[PDB]
Amino acid sequence: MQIFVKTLTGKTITLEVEPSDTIENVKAKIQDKEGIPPDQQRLIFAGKQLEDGRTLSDYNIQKESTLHLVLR
Ligand SMILES: [Zn+2]
Ligand SMILES: [Zn+2]
Ligand SMILES: [Zn+2]
Ligand SMILES: [Zn+2]
């Protein structure tokens, strides 16, 4: 699965993942790409707040899905 993560500035990060990847995995990938610490990342897909220990398939995230880094 290719998924897109948009930063707070709207920059697009393209990530190669698997359905079973955790949100924690995806956070580490984001850190590698952009230097954003995982403890400072908060991810949403389709308005769902994404928990570190759940997987992409748990949230029905699919090929070409977009996640957003948000605040607060
Ligand atoms: Zn793929
Ligand atoms: Zn694998
Ligand atoms: Zn993985
Ligand atoms: Zn793997």
UniProtKB/Swiss-Prot annotation:
Modification after translation (UniProt): Phosphorylated at Ser-65 by PINK1 during mitophagy. Phosphorylated ubiquitin specifically binds and activates parkin (PRKN), triggering mitophagy. Phosphorylation does not affect E1-mediated E2 charging of ubiquitin but affects discharging of E2 enzymes to form polyubiquitin chains. It also affects deubiquitination by deubiquitinase enzymes such as USP30. Mono-ADP-ribosylated at the C-terminus by PARP9, a component of the PPAR9-DTX3L complex. ADP-ribosylation requires processing by E1 and E2 enzymes and prevents ubiquitin conjugation to substrates such as histones.
What are the residue boundaries of the Ubiquitin-like domain, all occurrences included? 1-72
Instruction: Summarize the impact of I44D.
Output: Impairs ubiquitination by CRL2(KLHDC3) E3 ligase complex. Impairs ubiquitination by CRL2(KLHDC3) E3 ligase complex
- Indicate where this protein resides in the cell: Cytoplasm; Nucleus; Mitochondrion outer membrane
Q: Positions of the site: Interacts with activating enzyme?
A: R54, R72
Mutating T66A: what's the consequence? Abolishes CteC-catalyzed ADP-ribosylation
Post-translational modification (Microbial infection) ADP-ribosylthreonine, affected residues: T66
The feature of type site (Essential for function) is located at H68
Q: How does the UniProt record describe the way this protein sits in the membrane?
A: Peripheral membrane protein
Variant or mutagenesis effect after changing R42E: Impairs ubiquitination by CRL2(KLHDC3) E3 ligase complex. Impairs ubiquitination by CRL2(KLHDC3) E3 ligase complex
Per the record, what is the consequence of mutating R54D? Decreases affinity for UBE2R2 in CRL2(FEM1C)-UBE2R2 complex
Outcome (variant: S65A): Prevents phosphorylation in case of mitophagy. Decreased localization of PRKN to mitochondria
Where are the Phosphoserine modifications?
A: S65
Function comment = Exists either covalently attached to another protein, or free (unanchored). When covalently bound, it is conjugated to target proteins via an isopeptide bond either as a monomer (monoubiquitin), a polymer linked via different Lys residues of the ubiquitin (polyubiquitin chains) or a linear polymer linked via the initiator Met of the ubiquitin (linear polyubiquitin chains).
- In Swiss-Prot or TrEMBL terms, this protein is called Ubiquitin
Q: What is the native source organism of this protein?
A: Homo sapiens
Q: Give the gene symbol.
A: UBC
